[PDB]
Amino acid sequence: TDPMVTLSSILESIINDMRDLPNTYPFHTPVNAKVVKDYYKIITRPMDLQTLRENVRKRLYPSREEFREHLELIVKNSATYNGPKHSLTQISQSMLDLCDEKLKEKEDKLARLEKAINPLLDDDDQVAFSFILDNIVTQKMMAVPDSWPFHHPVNKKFVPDYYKVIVNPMDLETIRKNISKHKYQSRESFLDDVNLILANSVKYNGPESQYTKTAQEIVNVCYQTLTEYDEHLTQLEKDICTAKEAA
Ligand SMILES: C[C@@H]1COCCN1c1cc(C2([S@](C)(=N)=O)CC2)nc(-c2cccc3ccccc23)n1
């Protein structure tokens, strides 16, 4: 049949199993922001199991990883709003732990479905291209001195106006997640996200801020390292295009 349907049925079954864990009801449905009146002042990406299930049914998750990322938001949001050691956060973690047990149990079947949905996940040129990009991010860009502001998404709890100014945020962890999902098939698409980190620093911090000078160095070492690997990256991009057309 349709591998997206089979995949969605597996993911829904995992939701059924997490819904059955003790004390999980506060996560079954969206937070009521008219009761929890400051919730959206603190949380940027609300998530709950009902929304997760409805998204599975809308065929929004072509792989384990897109599903797990949304599930992990449930934990992160609780850690931010309720606290990292709050019983609610521990409860949300028990659901993520069960999901990970189930994904491990079914990893070979899930891998087959993911490849049938998106053959590029099995293409050795896509995999090699993504591996190189990840190494540029971890070994060069994240090694820039004082680059910590750009390693992770800004937490709105700590910087409350950040996302009112920056409506298209980007950070190196999000880029790594994109790489793991093989989002980038060329250097151009990778550089769209890298440059967004710098543009956001110019907008939020100013062009002459030390934050922006650091972001500029991150971008500069990215260009420098991509240039060093130009001939290999060009071959991979050509072969990825050929794989993409053949599908
Ligand atoms: C907004 C700022 C400039 O523009 C680039 C992004 N910047 C960030 C980013 C982060 C993150 S975080 C920890 N996940 O929010 C991602 C690591 N933290 C902080 C920050 C947090 C809490 C207190 C701070 C006090 C002084 C200076 C910065 C503070 N600023």
From Swiss-Prot:
Intracellular or extracellular location(s): Nucleus
Ranges of residues in domain Bromo: 1-106, 120-229
Post-translational modification: Phosphorylated by casein kinase II in vitro.
Domain of life: Eukaryota
Region (Interaction with ASF1A and ASF1B): 1-247
Subunit structure: Component of the TFIID basal transcription factor complex, composed of TATA-box-binding protein TBP, and a number of TBP-associated factors (TAFs), including TAF1, TAF2, TAF3, TAF4, TAF5, TAF6, TAF7, TAF8, TAF9, TAF10, TAF11, TAF12 and TAF13. Interacts with TAF7; the interaction is direct. TAF1, when part of the TFIID complex, interacts with C-terminus of TP53.
Recorded domain comment: The Bromo domain mediates interaction with histones that have acetylated lysine residues at specific positions. The second domain also recognizes and binds histones that are butyrylated and crotonylated.
Family as reported in the entry's similarity comment: Belongs to the TAF1 family.
Related illness: Dystonia 3, torsion, X-linked: An X-linked dystonia-parkinsonism disorder. Dystonia is defined by the presence of sustained involuntary muscle contractions, often leading to abnormal postures. DYT3 is characterized by severe progressive torsion dystonia followed by parkinsonism. It has a well-defined pathology of extensive neuronal loss and mosaic gliosis in the striatum (caudate nucleus and putamen) which appears to resemble that in Huntington disease.
The protein's role, per its UniProt record: The TFIID basal transcription factor complex plays a major role in the initiation of RNA polymerase II (Pol II)-dependent transcription. TFIID recognizes and binds promoters with or without a TATA box via its subunit TBP, a TATA-box-binding protein, and promotes assembly of the pre-initiation complex (PIC). The TFIID complex consists of TBP and TBP-associated factors (TAFs), including TAF1, TAF2, TAF3, TAF4, TAF5, TAF6, TAF7, TAF8, TAF9, TAF10, TAF11, TAF12 and TAF13. TAF1 is the largest component and core scaffold of the TFIID complex, involved in nucleating complex assembly.
Protein name in UniProt: Transcription initiation factor TFIID subunit 1
Residues of the full protein shown: 1400 to 1646 of 1893
